[model samples]
Target: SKWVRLNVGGTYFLTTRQTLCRDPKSFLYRLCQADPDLDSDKDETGAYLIDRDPTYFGPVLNYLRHGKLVINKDLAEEGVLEEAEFYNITSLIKLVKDKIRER
Candidate 1:
């Protein structure tokens, strides 16, 4: 199986289609499901462009990878919550919110 590369805010991340499509309602899920030709931007190396804050996306990817949300209040702040909302990951958003309230 081929892997998908995404360029988010000048940062590149390579991952599998299965990982991005784990949640059916996520934007990444739709992107993985859509035709490559339909995508607006494609890099020379075939990486897709996602105009988002790469700084905040790491935790999102981490959560997708491990199913455990390990958020650092200082590094994460509320941006991670916004990314969770953008990805339509309701559970993660709720978890982040709950954790924020705990602090």
Candidate 2:
């Protein structure tokens, strides 16, 4: 029920804790966990900030929000796969892999 402000490579995004925790073992979920090594940076005003490209973030955010892996021409399969793996969204990994074959 909490709102999360995010900055993905200069692109701003708004989401929620519920969506970020879609995968209990995911980095997004664990980012909430108190692991010093996994601490996420925040903007001065207090927003989770990262260096990943927002171009690939769209699919990852959508999959966690819903259960769909939506893709577009502007994106590549491996792009999402890499980002999914980067975030440790294990469920998304298999889906991206399967979606690669769906093509």
Candidate 3:
């Protein structure tokens, strides 16, 4: 199915390799690299290991999935920005920052 997996903060996630690889310079993209040398850290079930808040990673992944930033009301925008920065997702970082500045 060409699905890629990521385990963030002890939580499981499933997204496409294409989606993860959408940004060439991003952590998600590199983690999905075919070379085992680069994608070395993985959970027992083979999901890329990410020690971050799954709650924040959720919307970040969703942004890559569909190109729109959708955050739940209870979520902290800065948390998402932090995750985006960690992944080196430029657009996402700006997107969240813009949202934060809007208010």
Candidate 4:
């Protein structure tokens, strides 16, 4: 299967930790659908893009789980540092820089 490439200046598909918590047939769809107008308005919408690749998700998940992000060299090469900075993930950015220095 091909990995989804994000369009640099365009909208992209996104899912949330909330999505992982709910069943497809449950009320979660309605929960998400409540604001129909804003759904397609990427910047206006509350949703955030998630990089499902393990290289990305791994540090993010670790940060979520332990309140500290941990990045390996491969993940560091994947632009995790830049993403963290772009998204204002301050601690995660530090983690990536720290990992890079350790290399």
Work out the TM-score per prediction.
0.88, 0.86, 0.92, 0.42
Best by TM-score: 3
lDDT of 3 at 94: 94
lDDT of 2: 0.83
The parts of candidate 2 lying over 4 Å away from their true place are 33-40
Candidate order by decreasing TM-score: 3, 1, 2, 4
lDDT of 1 by residue, 15-61 (tens): 88888887888888866786666466777877888889998898888
Per-residue alpha-carbon lDDT of model 4 for 11-45, expressed as tens digits? 44434435322333322233344436534533434
| Candidate 2 structure quality by residue, lDDT tens digits, 1-103 | 3888778999988988888877888778854553465334877756677789898999999999999989987679999999999999888999999989978
Q: What TM-score, to 2 decimals, does candidate 4 have? A: 0.42
Per-residue lDDT for 51 in model 2? 86
Which has the higher lDDT value, candidate number 1 or candidate number 3?
3
lDDT of 3: 0.88
Candidate 3 local Cα displacement, residue 20, angstroms: 0.1
User: Model 3, residue 26: displacement in angstroms?
Assistant: 0.6
Off by over 4 Å in 3: 38-40
